[PDB]
Design an enzyme around this catalytic site. Structure first.
Site, PDB file in Angstrom:
ATOM      1  N   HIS A  39      -7.477   0.934   2.116  1.00  0.00           N
ATOM      2  CA  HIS A  39      -6.908  -0.381   2.399  1.00  0.00           C
ATOM      3  C   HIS A  39      -5.707  -0.531   3.322  1.00  0.00           C
ATOM      4  CE1 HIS A  39      -7.310  -4.547   1.900  1.00  0.00           C
ATOM      5  NE2 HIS A  39      -7.632  -4.577   0.617  1.00  0.00           N
TER       6      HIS A  39
ATOM      7  N   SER B 141     -11.290 -12.434  -3.686  1.00  0.00           N
ATOM      8  CA  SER B 141     -11.440 -12.490  -2.242  1.00  0.00           C
ATOM      9  C   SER B 141     -12.900 -12.699  -1.913  1.00  0.00           C
ATOM     10  CB  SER B 141     -10.963 -11.198  -1.576  1.00  0.00           C
ATOM     11  OG  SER B 141     -11.871 -10.140  -1.821  1.00  0.00           O
TER      12      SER B 141
ATOM     13  N   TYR C 259       0.737  -1.260   0.000  1.00  0.00           N
ATOM     14  CA  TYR C 259       0.000   0.000   0.000  1.00  0.00           C
ATOM     15  C   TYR C 259       0.768   1.312   0.000  1.00  0.00           C
ATOM     16  CZ  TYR C 259      -3.308  -3.608   1.203  1.00  0.00           C
ATOM     17  OH  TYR C 259      -4.012  -4.788   1.148  1.00  0.00           O
TER      18      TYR C 259
ATOM     19  N   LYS D 289     -22.430 -27.185   0.682  1.00  0.00           N
ATOM     20  CA  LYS D 289     -22.463 -27.809   2.001  1.00  0.00           C
ATOM     21  C   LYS D 289     -23.233 -29.127   1.994  1.00  0.00           C
ATOM     22  CE  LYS D 289     -23.779 -24.250   4.636  1.00  0.00           C
ATOM     23  NZ  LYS D 289     -23.934 -23.355   5.827  1.00  0.00           N
TER      24      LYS D 289
ATOM     25  N   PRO E 121     -11.298  -0.636  -1.561  1.00  0.00           N
ATOM     26  CA  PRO E 121     -12.487  -1.399  -1.962  1.00  0.00           C
ATOM     27  C   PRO E 121     -13.780  -0.619  -1.739  1.00  0.00           C
ATOM     28  CG  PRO E 121     -10.973  -2.763  -0.709  1.00  0.00           C
ATOM     29  CD  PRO E 121     -10.581  -1.328  -0.475  1.00  0.00           C
TER      30      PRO E 121
HETATM   31  C1  COA Z   1     -10.348 -18.514   2.791  1.00  0.00           C
HETATM   32  C2  COA Z   1     -11.543 -18.259   3.720  1.00  0.00           C
HETATM   33  C3  COA Z   1     -12.481 -17.219   3.073  1.00  0.00           C
HETATM   34  C4  COA Z   1     -12.316 -19.557   3.918  1.00  0.00           C
HETATM   35  O1  COA Z   1     -13.402 -19.338   4.824  1.00  0.00           O
HETATM   36  P1  COA Z   1     -14.384 -20.531   5.234  1.00  0.00           P
HETATM   37  O2  COA Z   1     -15.366 -19.990   6.196  1.00  0.00           O
HETATM   38  O3  COA Z   1     -13.547 -21.687   5.642  1.00  0.00           O
HETATM   39  O4  COA Z   1     -15.115 -20.827   3.820  1.00  0.00           O
HETATM   40  P2  COA Z   1     -15.858 -22.215   3.464  1.00  0.00           P
HETATM   41  O5  COA Z   1     -16.137 -22.179   2.013  1.00  0.00           O
HETATM   42  O6  COA Z   1     -15.092 -23.356   3.996  1.00  0.00           O
HETATM   43  O7  COA Z   1     -17.271 -22.073   4.193  1.00  0.00           O
HETATM   44  C5  COA Z   1     -17.428 -22.290   5.553  1.00  0.00           C
HETATM   45  C6  COA Z   1     -18.905 -22.630   5.830  1.00  0.00           C
HETATM   46  O8  COA Z   1     -19.223 -23.847   5.069  1.00  0.00           O
HETATM   47  C7  COA Z   1     -19.013 -25.004   5.951  1.00  0.00           C
HETATM   48  N1  COA Z   1     -18.168 -26.057   5.315  1.00  0.00           N
HETATM   49  C8  COA Z   1     -16.885 -25.942   4.932  1.00  0.00           C
HETATM   50  N2  COA Z   1     -16.482 -27.104   4.404  1.00  0.00           N
HETATM   51  C9  COA Z   1     -17.506 -27.950   4.453  1.00  0.00           C
HETATM   52  C10 COA Z   1     -17.685 -29.276   4.063  1.00  0.00           C
HETATM   53  N3  COA Z   1     -16.684 -29.960   3.517  1.00  0.00           N
HETATM   54  N4  COA Z   1     -18.889 -29.865   4.253  1.00  0.00           N
HETATM   55  C11 COA Z   1     -19.906 -29.197   4.808  1.00  0.00           C
HETATM   56  N5  COA Z   1     -19.755 -27.926   5.193  1.00  0.00           N
HETATM   57  C12 COA Z   1     -18.573 -27.287   5.027  1.00  0.00           C
HETATM   58  C13 COA Z   1     -18.408 -24.440   7.238  1.00  0.00           C
HETATM   59  O9  COA Z   1     -18.851 -25.193   8.366  1.00  0.00           O
HETATM   60  C14 COA Z   1     -19.006 -23.060   7.285  1.00  0.00           C
HETATM   61  O10 COA Z   1     -20.391 -23.177   7.644  1.00  0.00           O
HETATM   62  P3  COA Z   1     -21.334 -21.895   7.922  1.00  0.00           P
HETATM   63  O11 COA Z   1     -21.931 -21.474   6.630  1.00  0.00           O
HETATM   64  O12 COA Z   1     -22.236 -22.242   9.043  1.00  0.00           O
HETATM   65  O13 COA Z   1     -20.325 -20.765   8.440  1.00  0.00           O
HETATM   66  C15 COA Z   1     -11.060 -17.774   5.113  1.00  0.00           C
HETATM   67  O14 COA Z   1     -10.166 -18.738   5.668  1.00  0.00           O
HETATM   68  C16 COA Z   1     -10.357 -16.414   5.034  1.00  0.00           C
HETATM   69  O15 COA Z   1      -9.133 -16.336   4.941  1.00  0.00           O
HETATM   70  N6  COA Z   1     -11.182 -15.372   5.069  1.00  0.00           N
HETATM   71  C17 COA Z   1     -10.718 -13.982   5.013  1.00  0.00           C
HETATM   72  C18 COA Z   1     -10.570 -13.532   3.556  1.00  0.00           C
HETATM   73  C19 COA Z   1     -10.310 -12.030   3.504  1.00  0.00           C
HETATM   74  O16 COA Z   1      -9.442 -11.512   4.211  1.00  0.00           O
HETATM   75  N7  COA Z   1     -11.083 -11.361   2.646  1.00  0.00           N
HETATM   76  C20 COA Z   1     -11.004  -9.897   2.467  1.00  0.00           C
HETATM   77  C21 COA Z   1      -9.673  -9.476   1.840  1.00  0.00           C
HETATM   78  S1  COA Z   1      -9.535  -7.658   1.709  1.00  0.00           S
HETATM   79  C1  152 Z   2      -8.242  -7.102  -3.347  1.00  0.00           C
HETATM   80  N1  152 Z   2      -6.996  -7.863  -3.259  1.00  0.00           N
HETATM   81  C2  152 Z   2      -7.298  -9.295  -3.264  1.00  0.00           C
HETATM   82  C3  152 Z   2      -6.161  -7.543  -4.415  1.00  0.00           C
HETATM   83  C4  152 Z   2      -6.270  -7.506  -2.031  1.00  0.00           C
HETATM   84  C5  152 Z   2      -7.096  -7.866  -0.785  1.00  0.00           C
HETATM   85  O1  152 Z   2      -8.161  -6.916  -0.639  1.00  0.00           O
HETATM   86  C6  152 Z   2      -6.196  -7.776   0.451  1.00  0.00           C
HETATM   87  C7  152 Z   2      -5.126  -8.850   0.481  1.00  0.00           C
HETATM   88  O2  152 Z   2      -5.372  -9.965  -0.033  1.00  0.00           O
HETATM   89  O3  152 Z   2      -4.036  -8.579   1.031  1.00  0.00           O
END
Ligand code: COA
Ligand code: 152
EC number: 2.3.1.137
Length: 599
Positions: A317, A528, A81, A397, A94
């Site tokens: 960001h 993301s 950044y 799921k 964003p």
């Molecule tokens: C990568 C990431 C998004 C994964 O998240 P996650 O919650 O594990 O995503 P999943 O697709 O596994 O979904 C989880 C949900 O499905 C369920 N699930 C996952 N795998 C499953 C499976 N094999 N069978 C049945 N259910 C499952 C989980 O229990 C959970 O249930 P819920 O809907 O009650 O919460 C997370 O680890 C992460 O890093 N998030 C932050 C991303 C971020 O920073 N974004 C903004 C950037 S600026």
């Molecule tokens: C949008 N993008 C994926 C380029 C950056 C995310 O917002 C933040 C990150 O992944 O560090």
């Protein structure tokens, strides 16, 4: 207390060298030629040999981890950044699109804005009192530092690199937010002299005054200056504040808890592109003729309340990722739905201070240059919002599959269907289980995802076989994801080895000047997920000229998608990518339904 929570969090680890290099080569197989891969393979062996370059760099990183709270933090903030010189608009900050509100006139618009303001102040109480609930990911406590960076903060342009100011914990914490209407900024205190916060009713009366004090849309849109290239804005900023009053106005904006943008009525557009225009309003403002001037893009948090009921925000960001932002959004939105408490008589309220700006021929010129720059940026942005109503997390799921992996694999399928090959793909992974952790990279293009997309379109392969390939691709993605959130991914690690080499004053290792590395770091697909209870969605511009920016909020029965691309690249088209993505998701459901696991 916050500190107690942070001290108990594990520190960001430095992955084993050979481990990361192995994962690196595997992630490269699907996106580089056999020739390029063989060459990179050689470079890797040399790089990691006993007594070699890589080994020395690794020890440097391990030393770095011993002398810092987080070995990556500063390097990342800087490279991702602060040293990124492109405008923060579209390329970095964003945009957040929230559910449209039901207000039908000025009255309702201000009432909602007042409720939203009260809602944010309510959320802020937990931050100030350090009573914010502990969060988890994978059953692990999460870093809460990001919450102490979003309020009362602002980015500041610098000639070489930018900086950030944070007044949340200053001797005299700010007690005012800023409100901009018709390009005019106002300093609004949201706390009483006794320390208690103003109520929605009281806030409403003030916004009413603010609105009446800015009915004219003649003032120059000084705020649009914040949308230009950082090197250009750094120069214009320095000149802008040479003036006493201008400097004081800027100071108020920078110190404000957050900014609220009361946007003006805009030309009604066709219903087939309405959602896209709303996304544009939240991301960049629409242009110098609409609401782009009714902003201060250096501000960490900007809440936008449109004239037609649409609302959202745009955040800087450098402060955080989407989750902390949506945590605030979910709390606030639910707050605006709370009952109407009995309001006591209206007490005497001061007149919100108008933050004036003295315009000179130089400032005026800078403003016009900013208008021109932004106009070009906007014309080049191609956005397609897609509400995938067919299903959400529910289907994946029910199939015992990770919804996120299902969606990412679907995106790989859609891309392959269009281009005939895989491409370097980025998906944000939260590293918050570690102290001050931000993100690492999940690479969605893999050996298994490539095997699936190829098999999927092969009219010679049986459907049952394709089902196996599908599940294997999803499982491989879930595995990568598990490693990523636990600090076992390799992208930030390789970046660290590169920066360590620079700091060690040694020649840039060949592994980093390798064609494969260049390809691997050129993300034609940057993505993301930002889950929220609120039916919202976020958006951002692509990270490369010939790529796409895709964000989504997977809800239980539907998924909100945003897809961006640049018109300058004839080979990309947001609408087409969105269409193929929707069809890939449907085809994957069809395939799985055609072959139930039981029979
Ligand atoms: C990568 C990431 C998004 C994964 O998240 P996650 O919650 O594990 O995503 P999943 O697709 O596994 O979904 C989880 C949900 O499905 C369920 N699930 C996952 N795998 C499953 C499976 N094999 N069978 C049945 N259910 C499952 C989980 O229990 C959970 O249930 P819920 O809907 O009650 O919460 C997370 O680890 C992460 O890093 N998030 C932050 C991303 C971020 O920073 N974004 C903004 C950037 S600026
Ligand atoms: C949008 N993008 C994926 C380029 C950056 C995310 O917002 C933040 C990150 O992944 O560090």
């Amino acid at each position: 207390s916050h500190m107690a929570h942070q001290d108990a969090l594990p520190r960001l680890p430095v992955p084993p060298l050979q481990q990361s290099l192995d994962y690196y080569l595997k992630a490269l197989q699907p996106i580089v030629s056999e020739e390029e891969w063989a060459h990179t393979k050689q470079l890797v062996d040399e790089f990691q040999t006993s007594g070699g370059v890589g080994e020395r760099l690794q020890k440097g990183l391990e030393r770095r981890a011993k002398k810092m709270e987080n070995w990556l933090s500063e390097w990342w903030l800087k490279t991702a950044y602060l040293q990124f010189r492109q405008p923060v608009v579209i390329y970095s900050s964003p945009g957040v699109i929230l559910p449209k509100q039901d207000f039908v006139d000025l009255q309702g618009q201000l009432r909602f804005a007042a409720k939203l303001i009260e809602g944010v102040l309510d959320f802020k109480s937990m931050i100030d009192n350090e009573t914010l609930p502990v969060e988890f990911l994978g059953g692990q406590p999460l870093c809460m530092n990001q919450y102490y960076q979003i309020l009362s903060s602002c980015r500041v342009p610098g000639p070489k690199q930018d900086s950030v100011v944070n007044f949340l914990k200053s001797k005299r914490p700010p007690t005012h937010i800023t409100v901009v209407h018709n390009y005019q900024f106002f300093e609004l205190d949201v706390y009483h002299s006794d320390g208690t916060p103003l109520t929605s009713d009281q806030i409403f009366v003030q916004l009413e005054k603010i609105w009446n004090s800015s009915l004219q849309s003649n003032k120059e849109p000084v705020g649009i200056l914040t949308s230009n290239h950082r090197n250009t804005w750094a120069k214009a900023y320095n000149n802008l504040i040479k003036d006493k009053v201008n400097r004081e106005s800027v100071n108020s904006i920078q110190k404000s808890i957050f900014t609220v943008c009361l946007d003006k009525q805009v030309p009604r557009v066709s219903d087939d592109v309405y959602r896209n225009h709303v996304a544009g309003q939240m991301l960049h403002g629409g242009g110098s003729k609409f609401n782009s001037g009714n902003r201060w893009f250096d501000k960490t948090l900007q809440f936008i309340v449109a004239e037609d009921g649409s609302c959202g925000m745009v955040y800087e960001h450098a402060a955080a990722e989407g989750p902390p932002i949506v945590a605030l959004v979910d709390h606030v939105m639910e707050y605006t739905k709370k009952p109407e408490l009995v309001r006591s008589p209206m007490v005497p309220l001061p007149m919100p201070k108008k933050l004036r700006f003295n315009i000179t021929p130089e400032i005026k010129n800078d403003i016009e240059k900013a208008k021109q720059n932004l106009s070009i940026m906007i014309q080049d942005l191609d956005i397609m919002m897609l509400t995938f109503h067919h299903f959400g997390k529910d289907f994946p799921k029910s199939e015992k599959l990770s919804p996120d992996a299902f969606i990412q694999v679907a995106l790989q399928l859609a891309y392959y269907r269009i281009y005939g090959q895989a491409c370097a793909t980025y998906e944000s992974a939260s590293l918050r289980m570690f102290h001050l952790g931000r993100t690492d990279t999940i690479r969605s293009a893999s050996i298994d995802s490539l095997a699936f997309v190829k098999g999927m379109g092969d009219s010679t392969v049986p459907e049952q076989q394709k089902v196996e390939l599908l599940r294997k691709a999803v499982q491989a993605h879930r595995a990568y994801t598990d490693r990523a959130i636990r600090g076992e991914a390799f992208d930030r690690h390789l970046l660290g080895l590169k920066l360590q080499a620079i700091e060690d004053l040694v020649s840039m290792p060949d592994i980093f000047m390798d064609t494969s590395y260049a390809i691997a770091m050129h993300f034609n697909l940057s993505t993301s997920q930002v889950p929220a209870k609120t039916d919202c969605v976020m958006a951002f511009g692509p990270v490369v000229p010939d790529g796409y920016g895709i964000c989504y909020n997977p809800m239980e029965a539907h998924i909100n998608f945003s897809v961006s691309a640049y018109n300058s690249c004839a080979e990309t088209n947001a609408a087409r990518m969105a269409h193929y993505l929707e069809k890939a998701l449907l085809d994957m459901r069809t395939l799985l339904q055609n072959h139930p696991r039981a029979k």
